[PDB]
């Protein structure tokens, strides 16, 4: 019951800031929200340290309300609460002079409470409640400044894609109800081991669940909806791309590990899609001329990395990548937000350059972030990315091409991170920033974020060094493991990863300081800027034809109603043809009389 | 007892039509709400307040009334919805008495314990609707009226022969549903009676090829949408299916199940899809109501007591929030004067809390979890997938088009660039919004508490389709 108050708090907060909301001074919404986030972090750490929590309440007949707080749930809870409070303070700073402060923080409280309801769940319906609640809050916050049509269609497309994924989720849930009749991950898992039945149906439910996960974490083909989330405020974009709404997909695989571990083709396909998403994000990142989108495509590549990890069965390794990511991508995004808060929201790259010397305490933040994303050999991202690279080979499903693929992806991530950093801070001088670039309580929580990013790190280390997260995560759930490993050659692989990351950093350094940009590279960069002409096709044969069929079926309904009118008109026409039978000459009336009487007398036999 | 709760809206509507003043009808609807909620509590079962009186002893007709669990929450739904529509109305055309009359009639209709009384109210409810439609607005008012009335009547009048057959061919002593259920109809005789039931109930469900009465009906009513709210409450078809049509003639329904599920799925998809092309509020909401009836028909036709209870719960809540959206559109019309979705875009900045109310109502519309629509929607998915996976899957390419049309209309109406600025909120709209969202949250968050009484009926009448 105390576990439920953690979620109840950012409901009272949201109700206050939504109903009355602007009846408070400017700093207050952040104060209340941050207090609720911190008092949920505290009461969740206290419960987890106390061994765990369980709560059951009455709901739909056969479908009760089950909350389960274990190691895997508390891990996500602590992550989300800490990053959310840090982004809450950074938003207290960054939101200034903007109306809707209460709107902002009420949506924040709603987001946090719904994400907690999502992860803290023993029943799939509650997971889906959290899913659609997160989609709602995200669609709301992306369109926070609603006066712009440009930043409305973004959230529109976002929630449509989200609901496509959620429909896939609903169909998988209906499948896992028809078969067993439980739909509670605990008892469904305890009943699903042993006599598996209709393996086609099990793999199908897994396929639809993964389809929902793709929409949630913006994988192929639903990839396109994430970059437009640049429209939302920067702390919103951090919360959506780093701590929440993307971890839901990998967490679904982490909780359904019992299902996906007995599905070799399904897990192989999940790894394939993770690799494809990583490649797409990496290839199309640097061509993007906007800071937010060039970071969003890196988010795409990193989520592809995480799905690759969770695809081969490296669930604890995928959660390692999730931990590292939650640190460094929040660093990146809050850095970009302080940057455009210094330049008055200019929000471009080609209109940037030479911000290195100008900016104290910001070049350090951006450099730390760019190194973690590129995987600086001594940084958390390095451990996570190379643990995934190894788990590719060691864990099942083969990992043959995926290893060299992810290695080249590391090259490209380093390259585009260097492009970002150079074109934003080096190699020209443009624009204006006089008065106030560095804020206290904006760069201060970013300080703690960057520090943790540097030292997230060594919780998961190759087997000579302590792997702290594996024994914490494995016993509660994700129980099954079957993987080879080696030594000496594995550290040679670590050395290959470190060398590749450094060579990619310097390769981006030279290529993006050069300004040579050869003929083929210019076309490549242009195509990458337009996201490889994906949206043109997406609006070509699906969306615009859906509009066309809406219009055509409206025409068809018009014609159906006209046909009913034609029935009425046939009735009246038949009526007047029978009415014209009464001419008025008495001889006609007597003839028809005698005819009818004869007919009647004939029928009587 | 039940009789008083049923009659109170009728007599208060009389005292509004013949007597004065306008305001007393609001408190009459409130008193109905209170009494229907009280009768909803302490409910032991069907016998709750049993009432038996003779109507045609020689023919076998009795005034037969009582509260099921289904009748209880439907009483609550109607009383609440009509009271909201009474306070916020702003119609003031001196016809709210007709709306209270229709409320009492629908209450008696759901309280029908014998078949003929159900049929009687089913036919009688044609009068208010046509009146408040005809003399209170619309250019093609008489023509859309003739369309709707001819549809309903062509469907209904052969159903009278159907009910005469159901009484006579089973040798039932009276029209009581208890007795008629005790004497089932035999093969090659339940066929025709169920077919007569299915035409009359489908044309009023409404289903795809027969939905043509709904947009013209909803457009030409009083633009405040009170008549539209009650007409949306007039889609009671599904109920009669589950309670009357199927149990009384399941033999033909056994064969017609595939076609009925197909109609339900195709209706849902077509409505939620064409709602996108709708350029106006009445057409959009008409197609939405058609979608909801398609999903409810799917849930009922699927068997699967899960799907049956879900379809009924979805039907009740969908009536609620669709009437709410109609009243919201009527209030924005009264303060603006136009229902176009394109024009008057800036509303959200001028309207502080009307946008959030419209958003909550729309979210419940597209079936967002945490509101009343999601329990029934998902239970219907489960039951239909049990019945036919293909039809539930196709039919549920609906949340996509649902989200599309709801968010498109909400954005292009409220969120975009500011216009002149529009009236914010009325004093009655305050209690209206408060109670509406309160009910939505309570019925969506705790579908455990409600819908418990729906489970025994559902499981028994679904196993009836078994061995």
Swiss-Prot record, chain A:
- Role noted for this protein: NDH-1 shuttles electrons from NADH, via FMN and iron-sulfur (Fe-S) centers, to quinones in the respiratory chain. The immediate electron acceptor for the enzyme in this species is menaquinone. Couples the redox reaction to proton translocation (for every two electrons transferred, four hydrogen ions are translocated across the cytoplasmic membrane), and thus conserves the redox energy in a proton gradient required for the synthesis of ATP.
Q: Which reaction does it catalyse?
A: a quinone + NADH + 5 H(+)(in) = a quinol + NAD(+) + 4 H(+)(out)
EC assignment: the record states 7.1.1.-
Q: Which gene encodes it?
A: nqo12
Report the transmembrane regions from the record.
1-21, 29-49, 75-95, 104-124, 126-146, 165-185, 206-226, 234-254, 266-286, 303-323, 325-345, 364-384, 397-417, 441-461, 492-512, 584-604
Enzyme type, top EC level: translocase
Query: What GO biological process term is on the record, naming one?
Result: electron transport coupled proton transport
GO CC annotation: plasma membrane
Member of which family? Answer: Belongs to the complex I subunit 5 family.
How does it sit in the bilayer? Multi-pass membrane protein
Could you describe the subunit structure of this protein? NDH-1 is composed of 15 different subunits, Nqo1 to Nqo15. The complex has a L-shaped structure, with the hydrophobic arm (subunits Nqo7, Nqo8 and Nqo10 to Nqo14) embedded in the membrane and the hydrophilic peripheral arm (subunits Nqo1 to Nqo6, Nqo9 and Nqo15) protruding into the bacterial cytoplasm. The hydrophilic domain contains all the redox centers.
Q: Where in the cell is it found?
A: Cell inner membrane
Keyword entries, A-Z: Cell inner membrane, Cell membrane, Membrane, NAD, Quinone, Translocase, Transmembrane, Transmembrane helix
Gene3D superfamilies per UniProt: 1.20.5.2700
Output the InterPro entries linked to this UniProt entry.
NADHpl_OxRdtase_5_subgr (IPR018393), ND/Mrp_TM (IPR001750), NU5C-like (IPR003945), Proton_antipo_N (IPR001516)
UniProt-recorded name of the protein: NADH-quinone oxidoreductase subunit 12
Q: What is a single molecular function from GO for this protein?
A: quinone binding
From Swiss-Prot, chain B:
**Record key words, sorted:** Cell inner membrane, Cell membrane, Membrane, NAD, Quinone, Translocase, Transmembrane, Transmembrane helix
The UniProt transmembrane annotation reads 1-21, 23-43, 47-67, 69-89, 91-111, 115-135, 144-164, 190-210, 258-278, 284-304, 308-328, 354-374, 390-410, 430-450
* E.C. no: 7.1.1.-
InterPro entries recorded: NADH_Q_OxRdtase_chainM/4 (IPR010227), NADH_UbQ_OxRdtase (IPR003918), ND/Mrp_TM (IPR001750)
Q: Which cellular component terms (GO) are annotated to the entry?
A: plasma membrane
Q: Which reaction does it catalyse?
A: a quinone + NADH + 5 H(+)(in) = a quinol + NAD(+) + 4 H(+)(out)
Q: Quick one: signal sequence residues?
A: none
Indicate the principal place this protein occupies in or around the cell. membrane
Mention any Pfam family matching this sequence: Proton_antipo_M
Please, which domain of life does this record's source organism belong to?
Answer: Bacteria
Q: State where the protein is found.
A: Cell inner membrane
Any one Gene Ontology MF annotation carried by this entry is: NADH dehydrogenase (ubiquinone) activity
Its EC top class is translocase
Q: According to Swiss-Prot or TrEMBL, what is its membrane topology?
A: Multi-pass membrane protein
User: What processes does the entry annotate via GO biological process terms?
Assistant: ATP synthesis coupled electron transport; electron transport coupled proton transport
Which family does the similarity line name?
Belongs to the complex I subunit 4 family.
Note the subunit structure.
NDH-1 is composed of 15 different subunits, Nqo1 to Nqo15. The complex has a L-shaped structure, with the hydrophobic arm (subunits Nqo7, Nqo8 and Nqo10 to Nqo14) embedded in the membrane and the hydrophilic peripheral arm (subunits Nqo1 to Nqo6, Nqo9 and Nqo15) protruding into the bacterial cytoplasm. The hydrophilic domain contains all the redox centers.
The task this protein performs is described as: NDH-1 shuttles electrons from NADH, via FMN and iron-sulfur (Fe-S) centers, to quinones in the respiratory chain. The immediate electron acceptor for the enzyme in this species is menaquinone. Couples the redox reaction to proton translocation (for every two electrons transferred, four hydrogen ions are translocated across the cytoplasmic membrane), and thus conserves the redox energy in a proton gradient required for the synthesis of ATP.
Q: What is this protein called?
A: NADH-quinone oxidoreductase subunit 13
Please tell me the species this chain comes from.
Answer: Thermus thermophilus (strain ATCC 27634 / DSM 579 / HB8)
